[PDB]
Write a protein that holds these residues in place. Structure first.
Motif, PDB file in Angstrom:
ATOM      1  N   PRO A  41       7.659 -66.374  95.434  1.00  0.00           N
ATOM      2  CA  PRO A  41       8.441 -67.133  94.453  1.00  0.00           C
ATOM      3  C   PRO A  41       9.333 -66.197  93.653  1.00  0.00           C
ATOM      4  CG  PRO A  41       6.107 -67.688  94.327  1.00  0.00           C
ATOM      5  CD  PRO A  41       6.217 -66.442  95.154  1.00  0.00           C
ATOM      6  N   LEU A  60      10.787 -68.954  97.509  1.00  0.00           N
ATOM      7  CA  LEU A  60      10.808 -70.108  96.616  1.00  0.00           C
ATOM      8  C   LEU A  60      11.702 -69.798  95.419  1.00  0.00           C
ATOM      9  CD1 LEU A  60       9.952 -72.817  95.461  1.00  0.00           C
ATOM     10  CD2 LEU A  60       7.760 -71.805  94.808  1.00  0.00           C
ATOM     11  N   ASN A  61      12.826 -70.507  95.319  1.00  0.00           N
ATOM     12  CA  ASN A  61      13.812 -70.283  94.268  1.00  0.00           C
ATOM     13  C   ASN A  61      13.491 -71.172  93.072  1.00  0.00           C
ATOM     14  OD1 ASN A  61      16.796 -68.950  95.576  1.00  0.00           O
ATOM     15  ND2 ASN A  61      14.966 -69.302  96.825  1.00  0.00           N
ATOM     16  N   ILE A  62      13.156 -70.551  91.943  1.00  0.00           N
ATOM     17  CA  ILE A  62      12.835 -71.258  90.708  1.00  0.00           C
ATOM     18  C   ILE A  62      13.873 -70.858  89.668  1.00  0.00           C
ATOM     19  CG2 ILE A  62      11.169 -71.609  88.865  1.00  0.00           C
ATOM     20  CD1 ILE A  62       8.983 -70.820  90.963  1.00  0.00           C
ATOM     21  N   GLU A  72      19.898 -79.517  94.675  1.00  0.00           N
ATOM     22  CA  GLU A  72      18.565 -79.898  95.126  1.00  0.00           C
ATOM     23  C   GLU A  72      17.882 -78.820  95.956  1.00  0.00           C
ATOM     24  OE1 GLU A  72      18.455 -83.651  97.067  1.00  0.00           O
ATOM     25  OE2 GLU A  72      19.474 -84.736  95.454  1.00  0.00           O
ATOM     26  N   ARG A  73      18.608 -77.798  96.405  1.00  0.00           N
ATOM     27  CA  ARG A  73      18.034 -76.802  97.301  1.00  0.00           C
ATOM     28  C   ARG A  73      17.122 -75.805  96.595  1.00  0.00           C
ATOM     29  NH1 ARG A  73      23.483 -74.592  99.784  1.00  0.00           N
ATOM     30  NH2 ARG A  73      23.834 -74.486  97.517  1.00  0.00           N
ATOM     31  N   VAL A  74      17.064 -75.823  95.264  1.00  0.00           N
ATOM     32  CA  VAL A  74      16.194 -74.935  94.508  1.00  0.00           C
ATOM     33  C   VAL A  74      15.302 -75.782  93.606  1.00  0.00           C
ATOM     34  CG1 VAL A  74      17.877 -73.063  94.582  1.00  0.00           C
ATOM     35  CG2 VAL A  74      17.808 -74.595  92.608  1.00  0.00           C
ATOM     36  N   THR A  75      14.271 -75.140  93.061  1.00  0.00           N
ATOM     37  CA  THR A  75      13.376 -75.774  92.103  1.00  0.00           C
ATOM     38  C   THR A  75      13.861 -75.486  90.687  1.00  0.00           C
ATOM     39  OG1 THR A  75      11.471 -75.628  93.596  1.00  0.00           O
ATOM     40  CG2 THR A  75      11.025 -75.879  91.234  1.00  0.00           C
ATOM     41  N   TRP A  76      13.978 -76.535  89.880  1.00  0.00           N
ATOM     42  CA  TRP A  76      14.486 -76.420  88.519  1.00  0.00           C
ATOM     43  C   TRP A  76      13.335 -76.520  87.529  1.00  0.00           C
ATOM     44  CZ3 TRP A  76      19.475 -75.045  87.750  1.00  0.00           C
ATOM     45  CH2 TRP A  76      20.349 -75.203  88.833  1.00  0.00           C
ATOM     46  N   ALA A  77      13.274 -75.569  86.602  1.00  0.00           N
ATOM     47  CA  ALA A  77      12.218 -75.501  85.604  1.00  0.00           C
ATOM     48  C   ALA A  77      12.842 -75.536  84.218  1.00  0.00           C
ATOM     49  CB  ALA A  77      11.371 -74.237  85.778  1.00  0.00           C
ATOM     50  N   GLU A  82       6.853 -74.079  82.933  1.00  0.00           N
ATOM     51  CA  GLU A  82       7.091 -74.842  84.154  1.00  0.00           C
ATOM     52  C   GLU A  82       7.414 -73.921  85.323  1.00  0.00           C
ATOM     53  OE1 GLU A  82       9.928 -77.945  83.817  1.00  0.00           O
ATOM     54  OE2 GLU A  82       8.884 -78.995  82.194  1.00  0.00           O
ATOM     55  N   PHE A  86       5.291 -73.716  88.781  1.00  0.00           N
ATOM     56  CA  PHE A  86       5.923 -73.974  90.071  1.00  0.00           C
ATOM     57  C   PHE A  86       5.590 -72.894  91.091  1.00  0.00           C
ATOM     58  CE2 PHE A  86       9.270 -76.860  88.076  1.00  0.00           C
ATOM     59  CZ  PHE A  86       8.732 -77.990  88.665  1.00  0.00           C
TER      60      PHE A  86
END
Ligand SMILES: CN(Cc1cnc2nc(N)nc(N)c2n1)c1ccc(C(=O)N[C@@H](CCC(=O)O)C(=O)O)cc1
Ligand SMILES: [Ca+2]
Ligand SMILES: [K+]
Length: 161
Positions: A41, A60-62, A72-77, A82, A86
């Protein structure tokens, strides 16, 4: 025990950023960044995600942001809490900036991947000032500038005592 690791490229006087992109060309540092972040991550601020211009493959892109993300291609915190949640049960999470994000994770971090670059760039954003006594150096590798890399650079890995 999840290891939180900071990874950063530091010019002279601990400079990590300025208004625009850093004035160097270091593909060997990007290869070192890639090797040390793959299959992990990776936590970053929204400005750093814009600097990259794309998601980093194979990890894993956070992205931490107070506003809703538009990719949408990454996870947003929404917060560092958060962001860490993640990362899940990963054994090592990589924090790759920028300056504000380094300050927030420094106390939680037990390892640092530092690239020391021989460039006096005159920036005004610095890596956080950490106590050298509390960290020990476990890896060190020096390289000179060459046809592909604009400056000499020293890879270093530090671990908290
Ligand atoms: C602007 N930026 C931020 C950046 C640059 N160098 C760093 N160097 C270090 N040591 N640490 C960082 N956190 C760091 N961050 C970038 C820009 C591009 C890529 C990138 O695309 N890297 C590819 C490898 C390079 C490539 O494919 O051309 C990768 O797969 O990780 C990463 C970070
Ligand atoms: Ca900047
Ligand atoms: K998705």
């Amino acid at each position: 025990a999840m290891i939180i690791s900071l990874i950063a490229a530091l010019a002279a006087d601990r400079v990590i950023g300025m208004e625009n992109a850093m004035p160097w060309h270091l593909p060997a540092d990007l290869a070192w960044f890639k090797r040390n972040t793959l299959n992990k991550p990776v936590i970053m601020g929204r400005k750093t995600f814009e600097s990259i211009g794309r998601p980093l493959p194979g990890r894993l892109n956070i992205v931490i942001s107070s506003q809703p993300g538009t990719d949408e291609r990454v996870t947003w915190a929404a917060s560092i809490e958060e962001a860490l949640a993640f990362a899940g049960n990963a054994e090592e999470v990589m924090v790759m900036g920028g300056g504000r994000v380094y300050k927030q994770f420094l106390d939680r971090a037990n390892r640092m991947y530092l690239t020391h670059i021989d460039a006096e760039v005159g920036g005004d954003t610095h890596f956080p000032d950490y106590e050298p006594d509390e960290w020990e150096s476990v890896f060190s590798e020096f390289h000179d500038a060459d046809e592909a890399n604009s400056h000499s650079y020293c890879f270093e890995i530090l671990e908290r005592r």
